[PDB]
From a paper:
Here, we screened 26 animal counterparts of the human ACE2 (hACE2), the receptor for SARS-CoV-2 and SARS-CoV, and found that the ACE2s from various species, including pets, domestic animals and multiple wild animals, could bind to SARS-CoV-2 receptor binding domain (RBD) and facilitate the transduction of SARS-CoV-2 pseudovirus. CoVs utilize the S1 subdomain in S protein on the envelope to recognize the receptor. Consequently, for a virus to transmit to a new species, the gain-of-ability to bind to the cognate receptor of the target species is a prerequisite. Currently, there are multiple evidences showing the susceptibility of cat to SARS-CoV-2 infection, including the experimental infection data, the serological study in Wuhan, as well as the binding characterizations in this study.
The cryo-EM complex structure was solved at 3 Å resolution with one SARS-CoV-2 RBD binding to a single cACE2 molecule. The overall structure with one SARS-CoV-2 RBD bound to one cACE2 molecule resembles the complex structure of the SARS-CoV-2 RBD binding with hACE2, with the root mean square deviation of 0.763 Å for 648 Cα atoms. As the SARS-CoV-2 RBD interacting with hACE2, the interface between the SARS-CoV-2 RBD and the cACE2 also involves in H-bond and salt bridge interactions. Seven residues (L455, F456, Y473, S477, F486, N487, and Y489) on the β1′/β2′ loop of the SARS-CoV-2 RBD contributed 45 contacts with the cACE2, including two H-bonds. Residue K417 of the SARS-CoV-2 RBD formed salt bridge interactions with residue E30 of cACE2, and D30 of hACE2. In particular, residue D355 of the cACE2 formed three H-bonds with the SARS-CoV-2 RBD, but hACE2 D355 formed vdw interaction with the SARS-CoV-2 RBD. Consistently, the cACE2 D355A lost the binding to the SARS-CoV-2 RBD, while hACE2 carrying D355A maintained the partial interaction with the SARS-CoV-2 RBD. Though the total number of contacts of the SARS-CoV-2 RBD interacting to the cACE2 and hACE2 (143 and 141, respectively) were similar, the total number of H-bonds of the SARS-CoV-2 RBD and the cACE2 was less than that of the SARS-CoV-2 RBD and hACE2 (11 and 13, respectively), which agrees with the binding features to the SARS-CoV-2 RBD.
Residue numbers in the entry:
A (entry chain B): 333 to 527
B (entry chain A): 18 to 614
Write the structure that this text describes.
């Protein structure tokens, strides 16, 4: 009937950097998340707001699937009320986060001998981010008061740093593909309801 | 506006996420070289190392633009202080290149020099394995004497002027780095500030090392007299009864350790030591079984299991197919996680114990990995090896060999098996403390200036005969540079790390035994199956260099200073047995004796 495009978000070929995380909005579905929850193909699965249950009882307006890649020890930063580089400068989750985070090790697809440096993250910023705000601006982060004139120098750093994903890469710094689902519910006919 | 700390934190957040990758690349290159020696691997390793060193030097130069006087947070202050150390980046390029080429010359003339005696001009061999085997296994007087004097004459005489110029340039570098001399620069690793109550000065280390040595002097004097008594058997007319010991008859080239002197002074020669080699091969044990047993031992006390990457990326077994692998037992912290071991493991007991040492190194590495990049190290230069040694101590216990199933339960530890083990332990452990202390004291006095260049060999053998109780077989004039005969002196390595470490481990084990409620002597203690002592050690291990080593040491042992009481208690049964068998002998050494006259 209403088959949902879960293949193009979970079984996708390429993922976006955490600084430019890729948000895909899905609607008009009869979804079934137990297909993935009962698959044992994930290392981290944590659902805040709504229970990690079968979830075949929820009508939704739309569902955002924000996909990105980080290292291992930063997945714990993808959680409500958490602080850190990914939580403060790259990806913000409000304390009313009705959704969940799925995260699986990707030491085979996102890391190659010599180092995979295609993944970036925002290391510095003037302030924190809004709920679910993206920051792609490559403006040079000025620490002090001297202008950078548009190029790096004294107390002027680049706001983007690349991830150094290698194959060996102990599980802390190992690449990890993280898809965070957020199902919104507002004044709508709730076109996305499960079985 | 902003402060200095608000800018220093920003500068250190950019330094970390670059040093991480640029050091992991160099570590992966060096690992790929060590696991497979080729010609292009050397090129890749050199490229990565040069890149990492250039970046680190540039960031060190950028770091000094922030003064520590305007910085209050100590967690950022310590990283800034570790990054501001300029090394030799302060002298002119002329002198900074002269020092580097002198270091390279000294390090390559040590690994290339050979020694050859009269009566056989073709018998001209290197230190390893030519002179090494001689000084380690031979029992002939002249055979050891010619090797000793040859290695010190055809190699040290070529290092004396290089060492003088190196001392001068290092003193210039240290004075330019706002220090007194290079010995003060070396003691700087024990310097502690930015914390009241646990502050430690660079001059306090001298007082502590000199005080903790006066306590081991009776135990070492008894051990030395016992060795000298049991060495007059193998050398009836070559050792004085009231004198000191010849330097070429101590079990190695320099007399650093006395381990190879065991099958000459063993208390009970009819009782065999508990070697589990045959019991290990008879149980079809392999190298992976050895490391799985070591992991079992470490988990028994509460330390985590080795990661999966350790069991697929470590060179636990020798390839032996086409790769001329240099496999010296070493634990590897390849930057981002990636803890490995490159040991050529065999089915024996020595490789069973030494695997626990390397696994303890890995466990200390995995602990402080939560610290910032600049703080991922031991509290000082003697903590890593101490954690490594206490693990082998607890593993070599017969109560451990009987629990894992290696030893038969129908076995009893005799009242004599406790004295042979303790005697060998004092040989490898106690016999090296005076040597280390004397060498580092000589180096400090040379760097400062209490010894002019015309008394370098005069003061060396003076401190030898007055501290370690060891005399030269033949006199050496000022052209010799006997201290440079040691790998650490010719390659510019601090030596006091081997002293303090020996004192910390017994401070740990004793404490770790008290939490284990072990009742009995402090040589049968076995911390296995005791999560309390393991957790108490892990509380200190995850600290790293984040907090002063005084407070980190007070975490475990309860004391802030360097305490030698646990070390003396460890050898208390051996101390009493030595005091007993030293009844009709001379305890002490007179420096008036000379084995050449
Ligand atoms: Zn070690």
């Amino acid at each position: 009937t209403n088959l949902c495009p879960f293949g193009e978000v979970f079984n996708a070929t390429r993922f976006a950097s955490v600084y430019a995380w890729n948000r895909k909005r899905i609607s008009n579905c009869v979804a079934d998340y137990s297909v993935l929850y009962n698959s044992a193909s994930f290392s981290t699965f944590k659902c805040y707001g709504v229970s990690p249950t079968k979830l075949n009882d929820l009508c939704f307006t739309n569902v955002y699937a924000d996909s990105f890649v980080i290292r291992g020890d930063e997945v714990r930063q993808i959680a409500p009320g958490q602080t850190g580089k990914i939580a403060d400068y790259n990806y913000k989750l409000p304390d009313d986060f009705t959704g969940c985070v799925i995260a699986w090790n990707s030491n085979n697809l996102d890391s190659k001998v010599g180092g995979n440096y295609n993944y970036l993250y925002r290391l510095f910023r003037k302030s924190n981010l809004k709920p679910f705000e993206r920051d792609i601006s490559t403006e040079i982060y000025q620490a002090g008061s001297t202008p950078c004139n548009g190029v790096e120098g004294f107390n002027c750093y680049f706001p983007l740093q690349s991830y150094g994903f290698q194959p060996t890469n102990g599980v802390g710094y190992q690449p990890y593909r993280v898809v965070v689902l957020s199902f919104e519910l507002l004044h709508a006919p709730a076109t996305v309801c499960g079985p | 506006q902003s402060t200095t700390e608000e800018l220093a934190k920003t500068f250190l957040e950019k330094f970390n996420h670059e040093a991480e990758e640029l050091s992991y690349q160099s570590s992966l290159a060096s690992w790929n070289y060590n696991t497979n020696i080729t010609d292009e691997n050397v090129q890749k390793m050199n490229e990565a190392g040069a890149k990492w060193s250039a970046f680190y030097e540039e960031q060190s130069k950028l770091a000094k633009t922030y003064p520590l006087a305007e910085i209050h947070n100590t967690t950022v202050k310590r990283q800034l202080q570790a990054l501001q150390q300029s090394g030799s980046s302060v002298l002119s390029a002329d002198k900074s290149q002269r020092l580097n080429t002198i270091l390279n010359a000294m390090s390559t003339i040590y690994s290339t020099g050979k020694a050859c005696n009269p009566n056989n001009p073709q018998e001209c061999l290197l230190l390893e394995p030519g002179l090494d085997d001689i000084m380690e296994n031979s029992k002939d007087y002249n055979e050891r004497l010619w090797a000793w004097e040859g290695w010190r004459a055809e190699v040290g005489k070529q290092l004396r002027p290089l060492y003088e110029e190196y001392v001068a340039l290092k003193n210039e570098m240290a004075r330019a780095n706002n220090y007194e001399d290079y010995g003060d620069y070396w003691r700087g690793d024990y310097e502690e500030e930015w914390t009241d109550g646990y502050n430690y000065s660079r001059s306090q280390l001298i007082k502590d090392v000199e005080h903790t040595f006066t306590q081991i002097k009776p135990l070492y004097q008894h051990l030395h007299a016992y060795v000298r008594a049991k060495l007059m058997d193998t050398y009836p007319s070559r050792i004085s009864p009231t004198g000191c010991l010849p330097a070429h008859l101590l079990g190695d080239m320099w007399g650093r350790f006395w381990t190879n002197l065991y099958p000459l002074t063993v208390p009970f020669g009819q009782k065999p030591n508990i070697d589990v080699t045959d019991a290990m091969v008879n149980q079809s044990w392999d190298a992976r079984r050895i490391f799985k047993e070591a992991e079992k031992f470490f988990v028994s006390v509460g330390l985590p299991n080795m990661t999966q990457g350790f069991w697929e990326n470590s060179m636990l077994t020798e390839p032996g197919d086409s790769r001329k692998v240099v496999c010296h037992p070493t634990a590897w912290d390849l930057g981002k996680g990636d803890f490995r071991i490159k040991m050529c493991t065999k089915v024996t007991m020595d490789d069973f114990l030494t695997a626990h040492h390397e696994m303890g190194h890995i466990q200390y590495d995995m602990a402080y990995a939560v610290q910032p990049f600049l703080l991922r190290n031991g509290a000082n230069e003697g903590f890593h090896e101490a954690v490594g040694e206490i693990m082998s101590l607890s593993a070599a216990t017969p109560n451990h060999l009987k629990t894992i199933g290696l030893l038969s339960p129908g076995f009893s530890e005799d009242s004599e098996t406790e004295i042979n083990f303790l005697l060998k332990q004092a040989l490898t452990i106690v016999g090296t403390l005076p040597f280390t202390y004397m060498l580092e004291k000589w180096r400090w006095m040379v760097f400062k200036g209490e010894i002019p260049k015309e008394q370098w060999m005069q003061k060396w053998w003076e401190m030898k005969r007055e501290i370690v109780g060891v005399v030269e077989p033949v006199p050496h004039d000022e052209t010799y540079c006997d201290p440079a005969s040691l790998f650490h002196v010719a390659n510019d390595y601090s030596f006091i790390r081997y002293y303090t470490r020996t004192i910390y481990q017994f401070q740990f084990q004793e404490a770790l035994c008290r939490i284990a409620k072990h009742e009995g002597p402090l040589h049968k203690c076995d911390i296995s199956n005791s999560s309390e002592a393991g957790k108490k050690l892990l509380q200190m291990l995850t600290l790293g260099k984040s907090k002063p080593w005084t407070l980190a040491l007070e975490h475990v042992v309860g004391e802030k200073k360097m305490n030698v009481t646990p070390l003396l208690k460890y050898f208390e049964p051996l101390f009493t047995w030595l005091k007993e068998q030293n009844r009709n002998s001379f305890v002490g050494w007179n420096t008036d004796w000379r084995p050449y006259a």
